[PDB]
């Protein structure tokens, strides 16, 4: 149960069965997908991104570590992804509002997490929970297919579905800790808050995709008003 792809090993672990590489895959996944969202949505210019290949078939723009600001965003995503190892991350979301500091967004790209006990069969315990709990781990090749699906869906959604973002907007990363997460444990780059994000009552919701490695599960959603 391993992926024998040259293009895949450049960005992702070839094995995702065991707990560690599963969480590692989640980290790399968060990086790739949110980089794709950032570029495809034109929140950041192409200069911040360097082009990479997940597959010989598809290419995306991944945040460049050389560029300082992009490195900052990348280390932010790295911290959030690293949280999945401890299992203290419930959700990470790219939130777009008109004014800086708003709790009501005009656009949201959310990624919701689920952690499995033991060998990675039983889910630990929200509306997103049940669906992912139903899933089984079907091998690394299937996980590759899921990643491919997510990225393609992201690019297609941003370019051929969504309307362009408004002239001025505030984007930022907001997350939610699990119930298990200690009060002294804080994700680097993320100041604590008593506010997450809220949505309009008529906001449109579309599902981008999901990922089921060995011991973890993710669900990528997209809320938007531009849609």
């Amino acid at each position: 149960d391993a992926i024998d792809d040259k293009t895949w090993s450049k960005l992702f672990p070839s094995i995702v069965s065991d707990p560690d590489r599963s969480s590692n895959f989640m980290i790399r996944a968060i990086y790739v997908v949110f980089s794709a969202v950032l570029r495809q949505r034109n929140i950041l210019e192409k200069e911040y991104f360097s082009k990479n290949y997940i597959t010989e078939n598809l290419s995306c723009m991944t945040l460049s570590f050389k560029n300082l600001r992009a490195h900052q965003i990348a280390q932010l995503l790295r911290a959030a992804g690293d949280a999945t190892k401890d299992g203290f991350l419930k959700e990470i979301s790219l939130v777009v509002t008109e004014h800086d500091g708003d709790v009501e967004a005009i656009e949201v790209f959310s990624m919701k997490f689920i952690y499995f006990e033991n060998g990675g069969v039983v889910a630990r315990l929200d509306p997103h929970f049940a669906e992912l709990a139903q899933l089984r781990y079907e091998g690394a090749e299937s996980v590759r297919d899921q990643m491919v699906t997510i990225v393609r869906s992201v690019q297609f959604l941003c370019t051929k579905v969504l309307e362009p973002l408004p002239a001025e907007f505030t984007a930022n990363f907001r997350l939610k800790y699990t119930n298990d997460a200690p009060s002294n444990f804080r994700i680097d780059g993320f100041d604590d808050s008593s506010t997450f994000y809220t949505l309009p009552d008529g906001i449109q919701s579309v599902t981008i995709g999901h990922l089921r490695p060995g011991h973890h599960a993710a669900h990528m959603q997209c809320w938007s008003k531009s849609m």
């Binding site: 929140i43 907007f169 505030t170 930022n172 990363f173 907001r174 997350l175 939610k176 800790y177 808050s193």
Partner: peptide, 9 residues
């Protein structure tokens, strides 16, 4: 219950 935030743009 508990949340975290970041600055971008």
């Amino acid at each position: 219950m508990r949340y975290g935030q970041s600055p971008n743009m």
